[PDB]
Amino acid sequence: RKTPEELLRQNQRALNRAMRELDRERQKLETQEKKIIADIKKMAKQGQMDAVRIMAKDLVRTRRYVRKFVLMRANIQAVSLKIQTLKSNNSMAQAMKGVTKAMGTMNRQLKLPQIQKIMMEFERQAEIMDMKEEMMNDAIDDAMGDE
């Protein structure tokens, strides 16, 4: 059997090779088109009325076919971009699963109640310390006189 990673990496350059063929069967048609242009230019010198229209029709045919060649070439590109973002999606999924596992096993040690107990104890100790300070200053400062 073949790993799924091999299938995607094979499809990548398989679609690239399809683009390659589309490039070639495109490229032959611009050569054909330039030949038609040369023929129509040299033939128009003597006139002859009608056969110029047939050559112009053939020119339009060549343009219409290079249209479709470019179109399928573009379609292969979109297919490749989808299959490429697919593994990015898979990577996002696995990294998200990992971070969720980590965060769960992290906050499984400290919950709502015991930190609340620690926090209430903090507040009580702060109360005690502040009462120490306030009355310690109070009684000995009020012991002072004439000021």
Partner 1 sequence: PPKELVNEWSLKIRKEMRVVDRQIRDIQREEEKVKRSVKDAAKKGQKDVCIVLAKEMIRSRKAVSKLYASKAHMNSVLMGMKNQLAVLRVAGSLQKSTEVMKAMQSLVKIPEIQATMRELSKEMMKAGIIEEMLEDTFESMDDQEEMEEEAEMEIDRIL
Binding of partner 1 by 50 (CB under 8 A): yes
Q: Is the sign of the CA dihedral 41, 47, 51, 56 positive or negative?
A: positive
Ramachandran class of 2: left when φ > 0, alpha when ψ lies in -120 to 50, beta otherwise: beta
φ, ψ at 108 (rounded to 5°): -70, -10
Binding of partner 1 by 37 (CB under 8 A): no
Binding of partner 1 by 104 (CB under 8 A): yes
Report the distance separating Cα 14 and Cα 105, nearest Å: 44
Binding of partner 1 by 70 (CB under 8 A): no
Report how many helices (DSSP H) and strands (DSSP E) the chain contains, helices first: 3, 0
Applying CB under 8 A, the site for partner 1 has a residue count of: 52
Exactly one of 30, 37, 117, 123 binds partner 1 (CB under 8 A); which one? 123
Query: Looking at beta carbons only, is 34 or 122 nearer to partner 1?
Result: 122
Please list, residue by residue across 102-123, b when 16 or more beta carbons sit within 10 angstroms of its beta carbon and e when fewer do: eeeeeeeeeeeeeeeeeeeeee
Query: Looking at beta carbons only, is 11 or 142 nearer to partner 1?
Result: 11
Residue 123, SS3 per DSSP: helix
Binding site for partner 1 (CB under 8 A): 4, 7-8, 10-11, 14-15, 18, 21-22, 25, 29, 32, 48-51, 54-55, 57-58, 61-62, 65, 68-69, 72, 75-76, 79, 82-83, 86-87, 90, 93, 96-97, 99-100, 103-104, 107, 110-112, 115-116, 119, 122-123, 126
